[PDB]
């Protein structure tokens, strides 16, 4: 926790000369307003003004005027005078928070969750990213930084070790890193965080993306969180381990049952499974995202839960006690953390307050099953394209309630425009298959 005096003292002792008022749009892009430190007082008075229509992304029409209210607890100084940042909420000219801000939407969802008796919603993300080599002109190429495998010690100790430098710089910034390892695909890396509250977790995800993209550039590399940059190899996921807490106590933990899962946890996973098709578009917002959702690369392709499976939509880790959690594996690093977390929490709460019955967990004898038999059993498939994902999202009320009308409509319009632009392109695959056979 920090106050105005703490911020002034930090600026004075550390010789901060640049301030970044950081926020996000509906597309998850990290936006910021730069300010000289001489404006610090005006920053602390919630008097900084900016467009505000930038939150709409590329579907903005008219310039507005909106205020930035910083959150003093998010203060941190970058290790690269010095540059400091503050994460700000967006307020309208009438003093009320802007309804199109994902952070405010997540805060509202958490506030309405608190009326159900639960106090905290902890999130631990597992973001995976790719590192590509840069050419002479400084553009990213398609060559990977290394050639390692799952949990390999590929970038050994000497010469780049970009993952190690990222971890150390995050630790110096005040982050809580659990572990890091090489991912399955060559040049793919994963860094895991300790669990934190929802807003702090999403802020940490945004800051982690920014820090990774900066440090990779420092090492003459390019870091990408694209869900499926390369065909034929594993994609990048951002699995969300979530847990509910109502007062110094995990609500998912059953200390008597040998399974160790409370009926609340079963209701939560039933609700997440029920509305999985509804929030697929939000959790997988890119056209490329659905190129990751293909069988054989551990990404979930149908709606099921298990404790031990190759690619379940929901996984329950073996940990128990205060660390029992539910893992949603459909989220990709390109998704907006606030919106995806709000959608998942709303689906879980919808399952909780409807007392839904969780279906039977899947096990090894589902690998030999076609889609017809899978649907006969009751396992639905995730949407395969962004078009069909938007179609499914337009038919779900829980996602609309989670996002709010403004964010829901803007996201639908943006994604419809993006898909419309994508669908008219003639791909190289079409020119290879046709133009000689037809």
């Amino acid at each position: 926790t920090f106050t105005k005096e703490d911020i002034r003292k930090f600026a004075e002792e550390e010789n901060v000369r640049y301030l970044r008022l950081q926020f996000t749009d509906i597309l998850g892009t990290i936006k910021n307003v730069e300010v000289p430190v001489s404006q610090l007082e005006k920053v602390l008075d919630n008097e900084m003004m900016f467009d505000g229509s930038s939150i709409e992304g590329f579907v903005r029409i008219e310039e507005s005027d909106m205020y930035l209210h910083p959150d003093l607890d998010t203060w941190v100084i970058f290790p690269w005078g010095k540059v400091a940042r503050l994460i700000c909420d967006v307020y309208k000219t009438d003093g009320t928070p802007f309804e199109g801000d994902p952070r405010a939407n997540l805060k509202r969802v958490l506030k309405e969750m608190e009326d159900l008796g639960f106090t905290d919603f902890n999130l631990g993300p597992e973001p995976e990213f790719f590192l590509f080599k840069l050419d002479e002109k400084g553009e990213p190429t398609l060559e990977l930084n290394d050639d390692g495998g799952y949990f390999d010690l590929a970038p050994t100790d000497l010469g780049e070790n970009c993952r190690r430098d990222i971890v150390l710089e995050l630790e110096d910034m005040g982050f809580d890193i659990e572990a890091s390892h090489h991912e399955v695909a060559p040049g793919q890396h994963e860094i895991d965080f300790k669990y934190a509250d929802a807003v702090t977790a999403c802020d940490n995800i945004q800051t982690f993306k920014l820090v990774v993209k900066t440090i990779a550039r420092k090492h003459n590399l390019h870091a990408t969180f694209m869900p499926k940059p390369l065909f034929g190899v594993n994609g990048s996921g951002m699995h969300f381990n979530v847990s509910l807490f109502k007062g110094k106590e995990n609500a998912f933990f059953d200390p008597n049952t040998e399974m160790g899962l409370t009926e609340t946890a079963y209701q939560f996973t039933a609700g997440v499974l029920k509305n999985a098709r509804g929030f697929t578009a939000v959790c997988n917002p890119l056209v490329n995202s659905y190129k990751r959702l293909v069988p054989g690369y551990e990404a979930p392709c149908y709606i099921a839960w298990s404790g031990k499976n190759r690619s379940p939509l929901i996984r329950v880790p073996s940990s128990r006690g205060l660390s029992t959690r539910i893992e949603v594996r459909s989220v990709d690093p390109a998704a907006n953390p606030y919106m995806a977390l709000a959608a998942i929490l709303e689906a879980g709460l919808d399952g909780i307050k409807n007392k839904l019955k969780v279906p039977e967990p899947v096990n090894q004898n589902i690998y030999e099953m076609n889609r017809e038999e899978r649907e006969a059993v009751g396992i639905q498939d995730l949407p395969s394209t962004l078009y069909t994902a938007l179609k499914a999202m337009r038919e779900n009320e829980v996602i609309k309630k989670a996002l709010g009308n403004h964010i829901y409509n803007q996201f639908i319009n943006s994604k419809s425009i993006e898909w419309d632009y994508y669908r008219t392109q003639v791909s190289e695959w079409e020119r290879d298959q046709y133009m000689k056979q037809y």
């Binding site: 495998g149 799952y150 399955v184 695909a185 034929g232 190899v233 594993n234 069988p295 054989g296 690369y297 551990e298 190759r310 690998y367």
Partner: peptide
């Protein structure tokens, strides 16, 4: 193969 992603070195 079920574990297509793990056999990418051969394909």
């Amino acid at each position: 193969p079920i574990n297509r992603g793990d056999l990418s070195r051969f394909i």
